Amino acid sequence: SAIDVVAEKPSVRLTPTMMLYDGSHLLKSGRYLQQELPVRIAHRIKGFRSLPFIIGCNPTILHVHELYIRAFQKLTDFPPIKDQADEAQYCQLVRQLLDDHKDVVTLLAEGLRESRKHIEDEKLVRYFLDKTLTSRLGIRMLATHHLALHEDKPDFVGIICTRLSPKKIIEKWVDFARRLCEHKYGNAPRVRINGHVAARFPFIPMPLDYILPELLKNAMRATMESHLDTPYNVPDVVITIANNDVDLIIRISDRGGGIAHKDLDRVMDYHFTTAGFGFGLPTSRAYAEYLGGSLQLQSLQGIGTDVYLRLRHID
């Protein structure tokens, strides 16, 4: 019954600009998390109680539901943070929860894959995954930021990098994606980065750390699958960075044949794949829209695809 009571509370949202602005600040941050996390968690548990019956009964969905109830119990059992010793122990609980739930997206994807087909309105699944995954991103950002306030890392204020270079973060994920792709196909497309390659601004890397490898793996696979006769010489994937006062734009352009007309209306659905998870595109778009940006696709059937990632700047 505690879930219904806590879910009726508002929810004080923290904007990345508020996050940017002795150890007294650690106690105020700890107390904010103590009051905020159970409220966000209770809304998500209410979302699990509302899922279509045949889906809620799935053993994997039930397991994630139990994990989330257990997380609510541990957080609500923690006594109010009064001093530094209390805040240090609360950090341990936050680390444990971050670790215990690192594979939640995989569990949700597999628990929903077959059960999803036995319901009358599949759009409930899109709403549920969008709400759950974006709240999970927001929760993981608040939790990781609080922990990182205990570090003395240059160019960082918690998880906010004060001098983020989009070129360097893109390069980090290009090297990761090229290695996965070379392991499966024997080669990977070269990536050229152009535009505002020297841009540097305050930014939270965490959402880029999910979106970028997802969009890079897609562009590289499409390129390899459409050039099977010449895997040793495939067209480059071209990334353009456009930086302005309102937003950061990253366009990832490939020559991997495009997204077919018959598939275009389904690529943004969870579980849809032409391979195998089918989560990269709908999750990337939900994450981007949650942070005030967008993910837009331009398909040139027979040639390739342009993917546009737009993320807002920190005021």
Ligand X SMILES: Nc1ncnc2c1ncn2[C@@H]1O[C@H](COP(=O)(O)OP(=O)(O)O)[C@@H](O)[C@H]1O
Binding mask 50-79 for ligand A1A40 (x = CB under 6 A): ------------------x--xx-------
**Which stretch, 12-20, 113-121, 165-173, 279-287, contacts ligand X (CB under 6 A)?**
279-287
**Which stretch, 73-81, 143-151, 217-225, 285-293, contacts Mg ion (CB under 5 A)?**
217-225
Rounded CA-CA distance 124/131 in Å is 11
Our finding on whether 276 is near ligand X (CB under 6 A) is yes
Binding mask 269-308 for Mg ion (x = CB under 5 A): -----------x----------------------------
**Which stretch, 90-98, 115-123, 169-177, 223-231, contacts ligand A1A40 (CB under 6 A)?**
90-98
Rounded CA-CA distance 43/26 in Å is 26
Our finding on whether 267 is near ligand A1A40 (CB under 6 A) is no
**61: closest CA among 13, 114, 112?**
112
The one-letter amino acid code at 100 reads: D
195 in the Ramachandran plot: left (φ > 0), alpha (ψ -120 to 50) or beta?
A: left
Nearest distance, CB of residue 211 and ligand A1A40, angstroms: 17
Using the 8-state DSSP alphabet, how is residue 83 labeled? Answer: S
Our finding on whether 278 is near K ion (CB under 5 A) is yes
Our finding on whether 9 is near ligand A1A40 (CB under 6 A) is no
**51: closest CA among 106, 113, 129, 147?**
129
Q: Out of Mg ion, K ion, a second copy, none, which partner does residue 55 contact, by CB within 5 to 8 A per kind?
A: a second copy
**What distance, in Å, lies between the first and last C-alpha atoms of the chain?**
40
Rounded CA-CA distance 212/284 in Å is 9
β-sheet bridge partners, residue 155: none
Give the rounded distance of the alpha carbon of 293 from its chain centre: 13
Complex with ligand A1A40: residue 140 or 172, whichever CB lies closer: 140
14 in the Ramachandran plot: left (φ > 0), alpha (ψ -120 to 50) or beta?
A: beta
Nearest distance, CB of residue 106 and ligand X, angstroms: 12
Widest pairwise Cα distance in the chain? 66
Q: Out of a second copy, ligand A1A40, ligand X, none, which partner does residue 239 contact, by CB within 5 to 8 A per kind?
A: none
Nearest distance, CB of residue 210 and ligand A1A40, angstroms: 12
The one-letter amino acid code at 18 reads: M
Strands (E), 179-285: 191-195, 201-203, 237-243, 247-253
Our finding on whether 281 is near ligand X (CB under 6 A) is yes
By beta carbon distance, the residue nearest ligand X is 280
Nearest distance, CB of residue 256 and Mg ion, angstroms: 12
Residues 293-312 that bind ligand X (CB under 6 A): 305
**Contacts of 310 by beta carbon, 8 Å cutoff, 6+ apart:** 247, 248, 249, 250, 288, 293, 294, 295, 296
Question: Annotated binding site for ATP: which residue ranges?
Answer: 218, 254, 273-274, 278, 281
Q: Tell me which residues touch Mg ion (CB under 5 A).
A: 218, 280
Question: Annotated binding site: which residue ranges?
Answer: 218, 254, 267, 269, 272-274, 278, 281
